[PDB]
Each structure stands twice: as C-alpha cells, then as structure tokens.
Design an enzyme around this catalytic site. Structure first.
Site, mmCIF file in Angstrom:
data_model
loop_
_atom_site.group_PDB
_atom_site.id
_atom_site.type_symbol
_atom_site.label_atom_id
_atom_site.label_comp_id
_atom_site.label_asym_id
_atom_site.label_seq_id
_atom_site.Cartn_x
_atom_site.Cartn_y
_atom_site.Cartn_z
ATOM 1 N N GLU A 91 0.748 -1.183 0.081
ATOM 2 C CA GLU A 91 0.119 -0.151 0.044
ATOM 3 C C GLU A 91 0.674 1.444 -0.022
ATOM 4 O OE1 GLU A 91 -4.019 -1.690 1.271
ATOM 5 O OE2 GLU A 91 -3.112 -0.775 -0.329
ATOM 6 N N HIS A 94 1.924 1.822 -3.461
ATOM 7 C CA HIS A 94 0.916 2.301 -4.093
ATOM 8 C C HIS A 94 0.942 4.032 -4.176
ATOM 9 C CE1 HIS A 94 -0.274 -1.411 -4.742
ATOM 10 N NE2 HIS A 94 -1.521 -1.333 -3.927
ATOM 11 N N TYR A 98 1.497 6.891 -7.287
ATOM 12 C CA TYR A 98 0.609 8.039 -7.273
ATOM 13 C C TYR A 98 1.117 9.449 -7.139
ATOM 14 C CZ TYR A 98 -3.068 4.570 -7.482
ATOM 15 O OH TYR A 98 -3.775 3.469 -8.040
ATOM 16 N N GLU A 154 -11.675 -2.927 -1.103
ATOM 17 C CA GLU A 154 -10.606 -3.322 -1.944
ATOM 18 C C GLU A 154 -11.073 -3.597 -3.301
ATOM 19 O OE1 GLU A 154 -8.689 -2.318 0.114
ATOM 20 O OE2 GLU A 154 -7.024 -3.905 -0.546
ATOM 21 N N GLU A 188 -4.930 -4.890 -5.538
ATOM 22 C CA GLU A 188 -6.156 -4.709 -4.874
ATOM 23 C C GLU A 188 -6.924 -6.017 -5.152
ATOM 24 O OE1 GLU A 188 -6.448 -2.119 -2.998
ATOM 25 O OE2 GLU A 188 -4.835 -1.767 -3.832
ATOM 26 N N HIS A 191 -5.968 -8.583 -2.525
ATOM 27 C CA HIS A 191 -6.165 -8.126 -1.191
ATOM 28 C C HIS A 191 -7.911 -8.336 -1.031
ATOM 29 C CE1 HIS A 191 -2.903 -5.209 -1.793
ATOM 30 N NE2 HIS A 191 -2.374 -6.173 -0.801
HETATM 31 FE FE FE Z 1 -4.900 -2.731 -1.197
#
Ligand code: FE
Ligand code: FE
Lengths: 272, 255
Positions: A91, A94, A98, A154, A188, A191
């Site tokens: 995460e 991630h 971004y 998710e 995702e 997850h």
């Molecule tokens: Fe996630």
C-alpha cells in the site's frame, strides 16, 4: 475466541491456502522506481483539456485515500498476519507511485496545491469516510461485518477508476499510468480475495441482507462519483455502462462471499 | 507535541531525505527465506556434540516481537518514517519464517519441537531507546555466537541466514537512532543508561549463566565484554557517552 481466526514456530503451516496467498504477494513484489515514466509527457500533451482534468483528478483521489493495521492485530493466525504485513508495505508502494505520477504530469507546485485542496473538500472522500465510520468504527460493528467492509474497500471502491484507466490503455495512451494501473489493481484483487478467504473461516457471519447493505451502499457511492461528480463522459466513456460495470463487480463479490446476485448486471467492457 | 508525532498529502517532494534514504536501503536489502539453502546443515548438525546442539536449538527457540512496530507505525506521522516501518514489519516476518525453517530442519522430531520472562517485564523517546535496545543489545550475543560457528566453518545455512538477519537488525537499530535525533524532548542520559544497562544485564545473564557460550567453545568473560561493547556503541549513536568502555574482543566481528 469462538472464532479460529480470532483466538489467542510458524512451521508447519496449518492453513496452506492463507499461506499460498502470502506467497503470491511476495512473488509479485515491486517498487515505484521499477515503473518507467520517461515516455509519458508526449502522450500526456496529446490529451485534451477535459481528459487532463479527469486524469489529474482521479489521480488526486487515489492519493487522498489504515484498517489493515487493525486486522493484523485482531487476527491471531500467523499465516494471515504475514499477508497483512505485506499488504501494509505494498500500500505504501501504491502511494509512492501516485505521487510520482502526479509529479510527472503536474510539473508546477502551485497547481498541485490548488488540486489537492479541492479534493479534500469533495463528497467522495466524506461519503467513503462516513461509510467506514458507519460499518467499521461503529463498535456495534462485528468482525464478519468488517471483513465484508474490508472486501468492499478493495473490490468495489476505485473499481470504476481502474476501469477508466484501462479504457485509456485501449487507446494506446500513457504507458506508465496504465502499466502502474495494472500492477495496483492486480494488488487490490489479491487483497479483496484475501478478505473473501478470511470470511470463509467465520463461525458467525452476517445476514445476506446485511452483506447487501454494506456492498450496495459502496455501489451507491462509487457510481455517484464516476457518473455525477467526475463523469467518465470527460474521457469518452458511457455513464450507463459504467454504473453497470460497478454492479457486475459488486455481484461478483457477493458471489465470492457465497451469496446470490442482486443486480444481475453483465460486464459491459470487453477490455475488462 | 513533536515533529515525528505531528502533522502529508503526497510523498514528493521528500521532506526528510535522510529517513527516505534509509527506506530505500531497506528496499535494496529485500530477501526471502527460500533464498537461504538449508540442505547441507543436517549432516553438519549430526556431527555436532550434544552441547552444541543444546546451545544452537535453545537460541533458535528464543529467536522464534513486531507488535511494537504495529504501534510505532501507527503513532509516527512523518510519511517517510511510516514507509520504513512498513518494510520492517515485512522483514521480521521473513526472519521468523527463517528461524522456523531452521528449527524445523534440525529438530525433525515433533515431541522435542527463563530469559523470556526478564524481557517481557523489562515517553515516546523511552520507547524508541527500549526499541533500539531490543534490536541492538538483546540477541547481539546470539548473532556473535553464530558468527563463531562460521569461524569454525560449521552450519552454513544457519550462518548465512545469520549474516542477512544481522544486517537487517543493524539497519533497524540505526533507524531508531535517526528517529531519536529528531526528538525535541528526549529523556536524559540517566534514563537511557537505565534502559540500556538493564538490557545488557539480561542478555549477559542469558549467554553466561542460563546458556553459557562455553557450550560452543567461546569465552564468557569475552562475550560479556562484547555485549557491553555493543551497548556502548548504541549509547554513542544515541548521542551520549560510553558507560562500560569495552573493546570488542572478537576479531571475527570486525567486518
Ligand atoms: Fe490494497
Ligand atoms: Fe528487527
């Protein structure tokens, strides 16, 4: 402690299938640096005013977006805890990505500043906030309910934006954005899948009625965003078809949790 | 209250480059348990004496907490710090898998498969130091014991895993020191000593009373020295002075 997942030498593994998913997480480890953004500004500059507004905004919402630390404490099975520890990490990868994408396409620091302060205002953030505090934090909430909420965060939330970014891939645009979109949405899915696996080990799980309330409410929120607030018309997609996709995705999830469909919505997107 | 405990929307532009550089260093030392080859250790294990097996199994038992990082990570607000802690959480899971594999590889009989208590019972700044102490003082004597096995050329799976794990703890402990620098209010030199010195006592008792390093051919007086040396090195890192003045006795721990 009526629950196997909740009751107080990792090897041998008791739960091979929880463990197999941890092993899949590790297999797919990456870092934001791995993704090449060098060929992107040319494609970016080919986009039109309306498509840039849309892309820059859905990125900002991705960035704006800590329930995992809570599950990792609560769940007592080592196999699961390993998976959540990997989830925490990925995460954070991630977020880096971004930030990188924004910094690459929004070069001027004050433009970033205007953009983010806008996004804090908006409904989508407040609505998702209110939902989580309603179905997770309430403390009339139960573990089965949180597992279903977890799965929704998710697999329902941001499902429409991954789809929107996939639509741009269809048009050969922005390879760094679309390649990172693939990695993140894959992450995702895994997850969401893990949350559905946990749900299968519950003695006490919620009513089908209740599972629908959590899920269909997220569908309300996600559909509103991508059709009312930041409409996919801005990038040449059809709103009706997107609402339908969100429902196909939500039907799939209900069926993964072992319940029947609600919307009966087919997938409108070949490319998905 | 404190900068590390107070409030970001987007990571870049980086604000604490020194903390970020540590995260990137952690990422660059990623490994998994399966990369360590344990398929030549059982023959070696079977050639060991009864007292060497006793020692090695027992330290591996005590090797087999990151609840605490699941708390530091939730309390620290600086994104760069939260990144490091995420990665630390992962790596300790790699460590546990590693120690479980080792135990499982040497003690194949299920039926067979103290110090513990003293650790249990034992301000944000205090917790950082106690945290640094766990990485740095506790289990430093066990790392040195396995580096001794390496010098005698025994147990290459154990010793290699030990090199990897030792390196990570080094980094993790260094990081707790970088966090400590950034504190505006930190306990005095008096408190740190109490925490670090209680740590040393517990570790020293363990590898010289309960489970003497003599069992694998080491000198206790010297192991006591090395534990004190590691503690000294930590105190100075945290920005204080030495309490023991102990030289590192082990030439093999010099690289
Ligand atoms: Fe996630
Ligand atoms: Fe550590």
């Amino acid at each position: 402690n009526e629950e196997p997942l909740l009751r107080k030498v990792i090897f041998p593994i008791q739960y091979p299938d929880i463990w197999k998913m941890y092993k899949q997480a590790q297999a797919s480890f990456w870092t934001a640096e791995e993704v090449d953004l060098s060929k992107d500004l040319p494609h970016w500059n080919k986009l039109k005013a309306d498509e840039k507004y849309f892309i820059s905004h859905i990125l900002a919402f991705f960035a704006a977006s800590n329930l995992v630390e809570r599950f990792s404490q609560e769940v007592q099975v080592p196999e699961a805890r390993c998976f959540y520890g990997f989830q925490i990490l990925i995460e954070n990868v991630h977020s880096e990505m971004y930030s990188l994408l924004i910094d690459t396409y929004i070069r001027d620091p004050k433009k970033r500043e205007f953009l983010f302060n806008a996004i804090e205002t908006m409904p989508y953030v407040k609505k998702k906030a209110d939902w989580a505090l309603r179905w997770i934090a309430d403390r009339k909430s139960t573990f089965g309910e949180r597992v279903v909420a977890f799965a929704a965060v998710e697999g329902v939330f941001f499902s429409g934006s991954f789809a929107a970014i996939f639509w741009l891939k269809k048009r050969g645009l922005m390879p760094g954005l679309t390649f990172s979109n693939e990695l993140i949405s894959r992450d995702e899915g895994l997850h969401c899948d893990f949350a559905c696996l946990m749900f299968q080990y519950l003695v006490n799980k919620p009513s089908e009625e209740r599972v629908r309330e959590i899920i269909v409410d997220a569908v309300k929120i996600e559909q509103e965003f991508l059709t009312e607030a930041l409409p996919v018309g801005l990038i040449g997609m059809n709103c009706i078809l997107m609402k339908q996709y969100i429902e196909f995705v939500a039907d799939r999830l209900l069926v993964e949790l072992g319940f029947s469909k609600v919307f009966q919505a087919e997938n409108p997107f070949d490319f998905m």
